[PDB]
Design an enzyme around this catalytic site. Sequence first.
Site, PDB file in Angstrom:
ATOM      1  N   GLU A  11       0.800  -1.174   0.000  1.00  0.00           N
ATOM      2  CA  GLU A  11       0.000   0.000   0.000  1.00  0.00           C
ATOM      3  C   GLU A  11       0.864   1.267   0.000  1.00  0.00           C
ATOM      4  O   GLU A  11       0.395   2.321  -0.328  1.00  0.00           O
ATOM      5  CB  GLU A  11      -0.742  -0.076   1.343  1.00  0.00           C
ATOM      6  CG  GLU A  11      -1.790  -1.185   1.422  1.00  0.00           C
ATOM      7  CD  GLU A  11      -2.889  -0.929   0.397  1.00  0.00           C
ATOM      8  OE1 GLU A  11      -3.013   0.035  -0.289  1.00  0.00           O
ATOM      9  OE2 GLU A  11      -3.691  -1.904   0.234  1.00  0.00           O
ATOM     10  N   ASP A  20      -6.904   6.417  -4.304  1.00  0.00           N
ATOM     11  CA  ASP A  20      -6.357   5.111  -4.480  1.00  0.00           C
ATOM     12  C   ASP A  20      -6.494   4.647  -5.959  1.00  0.00           C
ATOM     13  O   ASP A  20      -6.782   5.452  -6.812  1.00  0.00           O
ATOM     14  CB  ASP A  20      -6.937   4.200  -3.407  1.00  0.00           C
ATOM     15  CG  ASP A  20      -8.337   3.790  -3.800  1.00  0.00           C
ATOM     16  OD1 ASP A  20      -8.952   4.225  -4.706  1.00  0.00           O
ATOM     17  OD2 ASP A  20      -8.886   2.963  -3.010  1.00  0.00           O
ATOM     18  N   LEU A  32      -8.672   3.674   3.545  1.00  0.00           N
ATOM     19  CA  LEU A  32      -9.718   4.310   2.740  1.00  0.00           C
ATOM     20  C   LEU A  32     -10.548   5.304   3.555  1.00  0.00           C
ATOM     21  O   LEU A  32     -10.994   5.040   4.662  1.00  0.00           O
ATOM     22  CB  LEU A  32     -10.618   3.303   2.057  1.00  0.00           C
ATOM     23  CG  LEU A  32     -11.910   3.934   1.481  1.00  0.00           C
ATOM     24  CD1 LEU A  32     -11.620   4.535   0.120  1.00  0.00           C
ATOM     25  CD2 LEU A  32     -12.992   2.893   1.258  1.00  0.00           C
ATOM     26  N   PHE A 104      -7.957  -6.936   3.596  1.00  0.00           N
ATOM     27  CA  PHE A 104      -7.649  -5.536   3.824  1.00  0.00           C
ATOM     28  C   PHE A 104      -7.941  -4.722   2.542  1.00  0.00           C
ATOM     29  O   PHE A 104      -8.468  -3.616   2.548  1.00  0.00           O
ATOM     30  CB  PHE A 104      -6.110  -5.478   4.063  1.00  0.00           C
ATOM     31  CG  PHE A 104      -5.600  -4.073   4.394  1.00  0.00           C
ATOM     32  CD1 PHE A 104      -5.297  -3.164   3.378  1.00  0.00           C
ATOM     33  CD2 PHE A 104      -5.382  -3.690   5.726  1.00  0.00           C
ATOM     34  CE1 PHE A 104      -4.762  -1.899   3.681  1.00  0.00           C
ATOM     35  CE2 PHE A 104      -4.864  -2.430   6.050  1.00  0.00           C
ATOM     36  CZ  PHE A 104      -4.550  -1.534   5.015  1.00  0.00           C
ATOM     37  N   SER A 117     -12.059 -20.404  -4.952  1.00  0.00           N
ATOM     38  CA  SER A 117     -10.686 -20.413  -4.461  1.00  0.00           C
ATOM     39  C   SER A 117     -10.608 -20.771  -2.987  1.00  0.00           C
ATOM     40  O   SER A 117      -9.640 -21.373  -2.556  1.00  0.00           O
ATOM     41  CB  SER A 117     -10.063 -19.059  -4.570  1.00  0.00           C
ATOM     42  OG  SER A 117     -10.124 -18.687  -5.888  1.00  0.00           O
ATOM     43  N   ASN A 132      -7.311 -20.116 -10.189  1.00  0.00           N
ATOM     44  CA  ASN A 132      -8.661 -19.555 -10.006  1.00  0.00           C
ATOM     45  C   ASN A 132      -8.630 -18.134  -9.458  1.00  0.00           C
ATOM     46  O   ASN A 132      -9.384 -17.245  -9.807  1.00  0.00           O
ATOM     47  CB  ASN A 132      -9.465 -20.480  -9.066  1.00  0.00           C
ATOM     48  CG  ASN A 132     -10.921 -20.112  -8.925  1.00  0.00           C
ATOM     49  OD1 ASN A 132     -11.389 -19.275  -8.098  1.00  0.00           O
ATOM     50  ND2 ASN A 132     -11.658 -20.571  -9.901  1.00  0.00           N
TER      51      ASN A 132
HETATM   52 KR    KR Z   1      -9.554 -16.432  -1.346  1.00  0.00          KR
END
Ligand code: KR
Length: 162
Positions: A11, A20, A32, A104, A117, A132
Amino acid sequence: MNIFEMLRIDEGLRLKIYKDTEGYYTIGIGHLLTKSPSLNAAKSELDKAIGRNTNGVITKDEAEKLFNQDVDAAVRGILRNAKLKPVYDSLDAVRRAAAINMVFQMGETGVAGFTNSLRMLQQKRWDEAAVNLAKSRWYNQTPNRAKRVITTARTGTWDAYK
Ligand SMILES: [Kr]
Ligand SMILES: [Cl-]
Ligand SMILES: [Cl-]
Ligand SMILES: [Kr]
Ligand SMILES: [Kr]
Ligand SMILES: [Kr]
């Protein structure tokens, strides 16, 4: 390496309000502030978060403080989510960091939507999961970061961050 160092890398650190990757007002280490297009709004959310009239600028300590809270909230969010927690608990420590990073970045909800996933992760089918995971808007919009996180989840090692 750890989650803190990892996210700090992904970040960055900005002491003045910025936008962002999706154009939203943010500050510090990926904190944010608002999805609203209004700078004033962003400014009001910031003063609320810090507890003083910041005028859009914060100190490094203040940025680290919000980062901490944010990391914290992310984990707790995972643990409180019925779809996420079981996956997270089945993971080793490195991989768990990858899960925290995603949450996050995209929130609990977003991640919880990676049904397929999540299952492969839970089943320890690393390569499959990695393929995936890359079939996402996430990967297509921030591919470099996405590759780092995916490699981390795929391998359980910090090589993408060294
Ligand atoms: Kr995931
Ligand atoms: Cl806050
Ligand atoms: Cl990226
Ligand atoms: Kr997870
Ligand atoms: Kr993950
Ligand atoms: Kr993965």
